[PDB]
Design a protein around this ligand. Structure first.
Ligand SMILES: *[C@@H]1O[C@H](CO)[C@@H](O)[C@H](O)[C@H]1NC(C)=O
Ligand SMILES: *[C@@H]1O[C@H](CO)[C@@H](O)[C@H](O)[C@H]1NC(C)=O
Ligand SMILES: *[C@@H]1O[C@H](CO)[C@@H](O)[C@H](O)[C@H]1NC(C)=O
Ligand SMILES: *[C@@H]1O[C@H](CO)[C@@H](O)[C@H](O)[C@H]1NC(C)=O
Ligand SMILES: *[C@@H]1O[C@H](CO)[C@@H](O)[C@H](O)[C@H]1NC(C)=O
Ligand SMILES: *[C@@H]1O[C@H](CO)[C@@H](O)[C@H](O)[C@H]1NC(C)=O
Lengths: 178, 178
């Protein structure tokens, strides 16, 4: 109906930066208005000629946990797009793992996300070991752990794994004494 | 016309793996056929409510050298999609840089692509230094360099930079003697 959320014509957005753009549109004199800005990555179609007279094809080299759309075209020598999602895989290792003394018997552990997530979620698992024995374990949304109440002159190992909702990746291991 | 490249109905593609899928379609008894399989990443629209009665908006936190599409919706409190591309940025550092002796006065240098490309191309720049002086330079598509005819008992530094068609990133530096 008139005044309900409708798409706006003549929108400008080309004045971009490496990480931003300025989106601008016509100024209505008329009344008071609310707005919804919508955006997505423009994906480019990748086409290939298969072998003649084949019934199936294995599409390879796809990224894990990614939504894709396929279409087939035939020629002699309404059709809907087919949607699928690749299965999840093991994520990569965390980046920039830093182990630091917070106090006399306290250690602070920080890291940044892996580049390859490969799944629906993002969690950080920290294992704390001494002489190969599990001393403490933590599971968080943010890779900022405060590990306190440890023994005074002890060698500890800190193992941070990324969890993507389906898989645990390899740990980034860092030694740190008290 | 009849027999020219037309989109095929009833295509199946859901039996995926972490990096592949099986795409299958109806077997025509009729004649001999050629095929084009087309695919792309299905991008998800990200919508947000802006402030009321505004004329412009700065879309931030975008990836460098990425194509995007924007649309605006107004409501009281044919319109085309607007396409743009973020500008290029400095790529990241190369991964897994390995320096090895190929012979007595020969060194082999290998690395893998950075995670962040941020531009249209992919090239590897290798600088070879001795006592801070530039000895050799190479520019290649593949990060596999064979550095021969060096002096016999000399310390050299190998600096590999990634070039993305617009920017050079930071070097990965590795010492290697002959
Ligand atoms: C992808 O799946 C195969 C089959 O299970 C597995 O061997 C491979 O490790 C997987 N990749 C990752 C990164 O999980
Ligand atoms: C340890 O991290 C906490 C935040 O999680 C912070 O308040 C504290 O100052 C940090 N200590 C050191 C030594 O960085
Ligand atoms: C970490 O916690 C989440 C809940 O917040 C849970 O679903 C997940 O299973 C835990 N991590 C691992 C590695 O299982
Ligand atoms: C993005 O652009 C700004 C402005 O020139 C610059 O300071 C910043 O370093 C750029 N980022 C990269 C990774 O090139
Ligand atoms: C050096 O690399 C070349 C390929 O570029 C290969 O033929 C040669 O065997 C390599 N040598 C060593 C020591 O790996
Ligand atoms: C490397 O070579 C390409 C041509 O193949 C050239 O366009 C580019 O300028 C060179 N690299 C750098 C860092 O300029």
């Amino acid at each position: 109906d008139f005044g309900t959320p409708e798409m706006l014509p003549h929108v400008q957005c080309k004045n971009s930066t490496n990480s931003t753009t300025l989106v601008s549109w016509a100024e209505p004199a008329s009344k008071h208005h609310g707005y919804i800005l919508c955006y997505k990555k423009t994906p480019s179609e990748k086409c290939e000629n298969l072998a003649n007279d084949v019934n199936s094809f294995e599409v390879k080299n796809l990224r894990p946990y990614t939504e894709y759309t396929v279409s087939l075209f035939a020629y002699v020598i309404p059709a809907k797009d087919c949607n699928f999602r690749t299965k999840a895989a093991r994520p990569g290792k965390v980046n920039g793992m830093k182990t630091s003394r917070a106090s006399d018997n306290s250690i602070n552990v920080t890291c940044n996300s892996p580049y390859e997530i490969n799944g629906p979620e993002a969690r950080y698992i920290l294992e704390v070991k001494s002489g190969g024995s599990l001393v403490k374990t933590f599971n968080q949304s943010t890779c900022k752990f405060v590990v306190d109440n440890l023994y005074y002159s002890t060698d500890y190992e800190f193992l941070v794994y990324f969890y993507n909702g389906e898989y645990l990746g390899d740990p980034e291991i860092k030694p740190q004494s008290t």
